[PDB]
Paper text:
The adaptor protein, speckle-type BTB/POZ protein (SPOP), recruits substrates to the cullin-3-subclass of E3 ligase for selective protein ubiquitylation. Here, we show that MyD88 interacts with SPOP through a long degron that contains the established SPOP-binding consensus and an N-terminal site that we name the Q-motif. We determine the structural basis of these interactions and show that the Q-motif interacts with an unexplored binding pocket on the SPOP MATH domain.
We crystallized SPOPMATH in complex with the 17-mer substrate peptides and obtained high-resolution structures of SPOPMATH in complex with SRC-3, SETD2, and Caprin1. In the N-terminal region, the backbone atoms of peptide positions −3,–5, and −6 make identical hydrogen-bond contacts with main chain atoms of SPOP Lys135 and Arg138 and with the side chain of SPOP Tyr83, respectively. At the −4 position, the SRC-3, SETD2, and Caprin1 peptides all contain a glutamine residue corresponding to MyD88 Gln130, and the side chain of this residue makes identical contacts with the backbone carbonyl groups of SPOP Lys115 and Tyr136. The SPOPMATH hydrophobic pocket (SPOP Phe136, Ile137, and Phe141) encompasses the side chains of peptide positions −4 and −5. In cells, we confirmed the interaction of endogenous SPOP to overexpressed Caprin1, SENP7, and SRC-3 by coimmunoprecipitation in HEK293T cells.
Numbering used by the authors:
A (entry chain A): 30 to 164
B (entry chain B): 91 to 104
Write the structure that this text describes.
């Protein structure tokens, strides 16, 4: 079962969040009968000291009807040219339980994201995509 | 330096 989600964070260059602080997306679902609910969590200034130079990006399982979900996922960024870039995928399915996340503590360097030459914050918005695949 | 633009390692925040 596939899930796709697009998240636009407005005014991203002005986030006040300090290292360790998190912004959470709305939930998304398959639209089908599996009852699974997901959301994204980003740390604009990284999860922790080790990752302070990075944006940290995670997929969170918000609800599932039984105990565990195995899912593959992929995150990418929309650029100013209208294309998905910097996509990274889980190389395998990971085991999710309700309230548990998986993702990339070092998803993209902040100094790359903020360099206008890379076009990743058009109109100062960060647009992220997430694809989820559940067995 | 270990300053790649991205790192592909998957982890969980717990």
């Amino acid at each position: 079962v596939k899930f796709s989600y697009m998240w636009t964070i407005n005014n991203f260059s002005f986030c006040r969040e300090e290292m360790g602080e998190v912004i959470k997306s709305s939930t998304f679902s398959s639209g089908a009968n599996d009852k699974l609910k997901w959301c994204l969590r980003v740390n604009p200034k990284g999860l922790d000291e080790e990752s302070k130079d990075y944006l940290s990006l995670y997929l969170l399982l918000v609800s599932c009807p039984k105990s565990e979900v195995r899912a593959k996922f992929k995150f990418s960024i929309l650029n100013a040219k209208g294309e998905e870039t910097k996509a990274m995928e889980s190389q395998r399915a990971y085991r999710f339980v309700q309230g548990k996340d998986w993702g990339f503590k070092k998803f993209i360097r902040r100094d790359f994201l903020l360099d206008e030459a890379n076009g990743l914050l058009p109109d100062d918005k960060l647009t992220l995509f997430c694809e989820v695949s559940v067995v | 330096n270990d300053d790649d633009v991205q790192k592909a390692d998957v982890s969980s925040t717990g």
